[PDB]
Structure 1
């Protein structure tokens, strides 16, 4: 399945791409409501104090091993976290209806994989806070909304996934 890689045997650090949203964290930051042509704006600052990484280590790859190997090949997120960065989204509510939009953090998914016989044997995962993403829907207090709009049961990428690797040495 997702464990089949055309890669030589060894350990690799992989950049799975930017744009990853996490399972069921959809509405953790709250939502915004507007109407009748009003412009709604939501934004945030990924200050080092809030933007915290999510580590999912394995036996072969511990937190430290994952961090150093990622910050060695890809963007050094520990350094960058000291400099506040902002982002915002804005949208105009329809003329005679209501608009609801909610915000959630996006991430860069990094992976540390152990390959054997062209198959992934072990997989560590790291989610580095990137920016944010908003979802909006128009409504009225009667409308029924699809719950997939409010909930994400499995981690996924809102952009196209990626597989940019580099074999680890020693």
Structure 2
């Protein structure tokens, strides 16, 4: 929780590749076998690509939005233009392949700091792209709970901390 920077408010890019807790399988999954190539994708548009604001007393949604879109990517303007992504994997011979899709996100924070630690923190998740997990299976095989389910938000890439001081 320690942060080595001066007193004041900051907007920070925490990076791409964040996935959210409990929504692992919301988009569904895909089953194939015996050398079949399975493909899953999505053309994200505004009606299915919803940003998640977790605001705070001093930092409301409009405040998060304007400061993020001024320094980093304007996700409102970008949302008007459909963009596709897809993943493919070939099922192995004589075995079955399961493959499920979930949205990835850019995590943004707006933090207040007193020179030792973050005092306040609002969070914004902007829809980015997607991520597939796959597993080989058969009907008799039990598999790890944690494959299907993420209990805490995490980043499948390396986390980042790129900062700008608001009202310097």
- TM-superposed CA distance for 1:158, in Å, is 0.2
Moved over 3 A (4+): none
Equivalenced residue count is 168
Aligned-residue Cα RMSD (Å) equals 0.7
Structure 2: how far apart are the matches of 1:39 and 1:4? Answer: 47
CA distance, structure 1, for counterparts of residue 141 and residue 108 of structure 2:
39
Q: Which residue of 2 aligns with 1:34?
A: 32
Determine the C-alpha separation between the residues in 1 that align with 2:116 and 2:127.
30
CA distance in 2, matches of 1:68, 1:84: 22
Paired with 1:42 and 1:147, the residues of 2 have a C-alpha distance of 23
Structure 1 position 83, deviation (Å): 0.1
CA shift, 1:14, in A, is 0.3
Per the alignment, in what secondary structure is the counterpart of residue 129 of structure 1?
Answer: strand
Question: What residue in structure 2 maps to residue 102 of structure 1?
Answer: 100
Secondary structure at 1:104 match in 2? strand
Deviations 1:107-149 (A, max 9, x none): 0000000000321000000000000000000000011100100
The corresponding residue for 2:140 is 142
Find the aligned partners of 1:132 and 1:35 in 2 and give their Cα distance: 23
Aligned-pair distance for 1:45? 1.1
SS of residue paired to 1:148:
helix
Q: Give secondary structure in 1 for the equivalent of 2:70.
A: helix
Deviation at 1:49, TM superposition (A): 1.1
TM-score (norm 1): 0.98
Q: Deviations over 1:63-109 (max 9, x none)?
A: 00000000000000000000000000000001010000000000000
Tell me the TM-score normalised to structure 2 length. 0.99
For residues 3-152 of structure 1, the aligned pairs below 5 Å read: 3-152=1-150
Residues 16-59 of structure 1: CA deviation (Å, up to 9, x unaligned): 00000000100000010000000000000111111010000000
